[PDB]
Structure of purine nucleoside phosphorylase:
Amino acid sequence: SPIHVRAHPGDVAERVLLPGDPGRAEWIAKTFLQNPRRYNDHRGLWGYTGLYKGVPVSVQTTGMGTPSAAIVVEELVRLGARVLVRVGTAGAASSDLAPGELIVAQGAVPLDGTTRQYLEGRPYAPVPDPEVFRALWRRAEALGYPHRVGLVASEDAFYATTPEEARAWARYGVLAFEMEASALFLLGRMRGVRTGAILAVSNRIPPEVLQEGVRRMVEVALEAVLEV
Amino acid sequence: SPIHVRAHPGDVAERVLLPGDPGRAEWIAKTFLQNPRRYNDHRGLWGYTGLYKGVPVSVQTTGMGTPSAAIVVEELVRLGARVLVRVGTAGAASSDLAPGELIVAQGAVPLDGTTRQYLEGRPYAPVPDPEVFRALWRRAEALGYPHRVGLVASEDAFYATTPEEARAWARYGVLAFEMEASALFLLGRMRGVRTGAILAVSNRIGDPELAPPEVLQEGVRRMVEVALEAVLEV
Amino acid sequence: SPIHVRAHPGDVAERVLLPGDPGRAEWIAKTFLQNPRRYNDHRGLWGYTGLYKGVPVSVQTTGMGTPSAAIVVEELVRLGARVLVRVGTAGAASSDLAPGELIVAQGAVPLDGTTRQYLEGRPYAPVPDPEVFRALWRRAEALGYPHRVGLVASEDAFYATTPEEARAWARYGVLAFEMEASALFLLGRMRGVRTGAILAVSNRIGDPELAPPEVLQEGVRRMVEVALEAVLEV
Amino acid sequence: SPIHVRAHPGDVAERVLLPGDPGRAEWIAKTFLQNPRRYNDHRGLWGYTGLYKGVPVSVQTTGMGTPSAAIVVEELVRLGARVLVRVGTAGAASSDLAPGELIVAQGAVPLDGTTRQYLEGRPYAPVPDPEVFRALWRRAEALGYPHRVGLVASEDAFYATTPEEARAWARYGVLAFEMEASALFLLGRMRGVRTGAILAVSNRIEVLQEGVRRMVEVALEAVLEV
Amino acid sequence: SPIHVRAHPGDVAERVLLPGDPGRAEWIAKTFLQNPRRYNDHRGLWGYTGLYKGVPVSVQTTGMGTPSAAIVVEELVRLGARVLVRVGTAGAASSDLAPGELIVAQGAVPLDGTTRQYLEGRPYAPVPDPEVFRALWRRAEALGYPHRVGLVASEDAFYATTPEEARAWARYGVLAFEMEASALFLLGRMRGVRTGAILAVSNRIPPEVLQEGVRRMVEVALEAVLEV
Amino acid sequence: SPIHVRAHPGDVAERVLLPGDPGRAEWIAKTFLQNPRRYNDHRGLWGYTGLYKGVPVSVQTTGMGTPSAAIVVEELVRLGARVLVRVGTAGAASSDLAPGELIVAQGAVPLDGTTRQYLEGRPYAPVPDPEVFRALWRRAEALGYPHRVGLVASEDAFYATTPEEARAWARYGVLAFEMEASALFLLGRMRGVRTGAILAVSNRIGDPELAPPEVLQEGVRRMVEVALEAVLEV
């Protein structure tokens, strides 16, 4: 059994959603999955496996930051995960992005040290698996949910980035900041698995507004993993 | 008029293909466009504008390397270019890529100093415009041409990269190596234009020569056709 | 109220223990504290406050990695935390360290991107508050549990470090690897609060599994007792 | 035959001038060389060979940027080139440089990614071959053309450098900016050939044409000396 | 015989003080040691050995900067040095430090190229040997000499650092700047020897005020090396 | 008065030789200068001023390493130094260089942290003043002393460089390693003064000891003669 996600291969489905908040993992499992079973609660990394339209799907908590996410992804891959889609929130890098809007991550600027360590400081362009990316985009359109498609930036120091710095990055295509995508994308290529990310804007660097965005994001992710 | 591409607005169309070789730019203009007109020859950066299925389309030589490509892209944008698609050859990093095969660039690892200077050494993920990327992929599928979709790596030193380094990069998703995409993708975001890149594999890293001129030529034709059909969609 | 640790200033004590595992935080609170109350469970970041030998003490989950720990530390300071001692596990880099042994962190090699971001890539020597460090060392000596005093390395990629690399770092003084110390130490100086870290060796770099639960749990108990005794000394 | 400069060893002389612009390569050939002949036009990298005062001299287009120049220099070396002198224009970083003024490059600050890739990010001091440098300086003095001897900076992003940054570099000895010297100098040492660079200030970050003419005359006289 | 410190086995004691100034090395030897002897003067790196309270103790000039200090340390270690304590001055980065005040270095921010070369550019946290560090702190206390315990920054370009930059570093815990500690600490760990550093504030980025500081500093270092 | 070189404007001439070893500075002052006077001995940074062929020349000890040399150069400039030429020894990186052979430094690879700090990590090409460089070269040729003209590398960690790394650098043009030139050259441009460097090979990297004092001493003599002649010509 893996060190942090203490489960066995048979407990995890090939298709996995990756929320950062365990509270959100629980909500997703109970709201969208049939017969959800929590296969792991060790370290608070709540992980569930259930069925969505007859297809097994797991929802695994990653925690915050690429170091935590990388540990979870590495172990999930060992457990048989083949398609992994991060679902979470992100702070808008510019004033034009309103809370609740969806972002299909086309790539992730690696401002984190986890990718840096794996890469030994070499340049890189973290991108999702092309088919998963395409599926997320298509499903968002099919469901008629407004969304943006583009870059996000994965950072390490939540409280270091100033609003001015965020807007500076926006001039380079960065739509929002989060703390997990870059590592997920890198590991997707390193470990030969398919990955993707879709986010809901929670603030610009409204209870029902954000929640509806999260619900849409999850629905899109679930529909997309069934497409691959 | 710009310093290098000495054209005047009106000469350049909103949609532009970006081959690296001027001889290829000429061939593209005469082979696919109706009423091809050369608007620039300064510094050998041959540029043409003609009609493709009734739509204005320019073909502009970028030269080799991101510094050259960046100068050309910057000036084209200043002239009103809106959609720019690089078309060229690339060296396969894996043994899974057969010569003549097409690669729709999903992103470009920035191993070049041009993006580095523009970014002041900061990390970045050079990616094409999502719509252009999608169009290139869809067109390749519609025309039934075999293709791979994924990362390429943009380098500065053509003769520095070894087969060992190439295979190492392939383990991180790099399909092939070329020398212009990263800067094109970065400028696309910086200057607000829609960019993309589609390449034809001309060889494997470490090869003294390029694949058969025939197998490559058919790849170049397909690549160009896909690019043309794509820019019309955006 | 803070974004992640959703508590109110009155909920958190000046003295706080920082385990990485929420299950460990719960065990510490229930095992060592009188009148323990959980003031936060949002994001699974379980935080408790109780009394230890008549002195208020909080136990706050940090999660794994400096990005998570930094968020928790920044918010804890806003909530009134003044003395923060990390208590966690570490993978021995040397063969000299055995599972269950304690390590009082004299400093932390910053192999993480969180300190790097705060420092804008500049060099630094993450070190605990001197008084806290002194108290942890003194208490470890007094209790008599096997321990070492020295450097640890705070890394981001748990699964990237090979046994070969670990041994190389040991030649430079690194006793073990963990994933939070560097950021805590940096923030201690930046925010003007007193920090420290004591760890229990849970394995050797390269091991597929952690040491026997019995061994590991005893090491954890010893480490917490030392930390609790130490925070009362400052 | 090399991949980009599709020439034969017999086509390239031991002494080569390296202009960046093909139109300038042509002008140099037809203006200074006897019986000039073009041995390559592939990829627009026009290369010519002719006689200068009875000595064979080639004029090869490098294109813009160190990546393009490195490809050209690597191939020229494989073709037998022994002495390579870059001739081109530069953007003055300092105010004391007037348009048309000549600069004999003593060294080149490597702000480019090509030298960075060859060096794997390690520090370096790109310098020309001692003898070629000495000859360029001496010839510029003989012909009596106003010149300066010092550092230039080779960059990748033509449109990224601001006047403020240029002025900052000038405080460290940078006289002007260009985009090829660093890689040429590095390859000179790496490949065992003699390189040098002389430039004509075309701007501040027939005036320029005369500078170009003087620049070329100096280079031709200098390569004959080595 | 070593290349720079041209001494031989038998000239250097296991316990060594490392002043940067040769004039100070001389003063220390004549002032605190019995039957002092200068075993080296080559390159001005004056080195002496004598007895302090019956214990052999060497006083070796390091010169200025980590490159010079690394050379001296490497050679001293080869000659038998096992406990090395740097004694010297530093420029206060903060406004709370008064000239002559003592600083027991808990660690040294590596802003130098010597440590960088040895480490091949990798991150590091230069710290003294814990026992020596502890001894210096304890002796300063026992002797009742006012002292501060914390970080110093080891730099290469004495004249490049501005008061503004110094103040910035102070906000990160840097008490003062000097030019030798980082390399001493790194080599201590690399060569398996015990090192430490105690400094007297000489300025901020009075003769007897500083001299008394220097005297207290040396006395503390001497007592500390006998303690380990 | 400067902090380290405790002298005053009057003690130092416009022309200065910069040996690293104070014992060599003394030997030079007494062997080539007339009416030599030592104006500083603080920190063992022995500095003398006398007349060479009726011209005032100073000989100032720099110490070892760019940090020490940088301090000395900065203060010398404040004291009125206008032409400064380093004279010292170097470890051959190549196998073709023989102990005692001279090297006129055309440039210095900056592998040191001093220039890095001054430059804030930016790339640079440390070079001497062109006229001083020319003077040294011409003088060496005139006197007919065997010499080489080219790059040296200025390093910080004398004991870190291996023969293997030295040989690798030789393939990129590095003739020998030393520890001061890069900073001297950089400050020359920064402070607007004329600098240069001429060295005598004292050993080949990897050698436990230097070459015979005889062979080496003669090299040192020629080097100083060349340097002294040169400074009087600019």
In short: Helices of chain B lie at 22-32, 66-78, 113-119, 130-142, 163-170, 181-190, 213-231. The CA atoms of residues 62 and 105 of chain B lie 18 Å apart. The longest strand of chain B covers residues 194-204. Chains B and E do not touch (no CB pair under 8 Å).
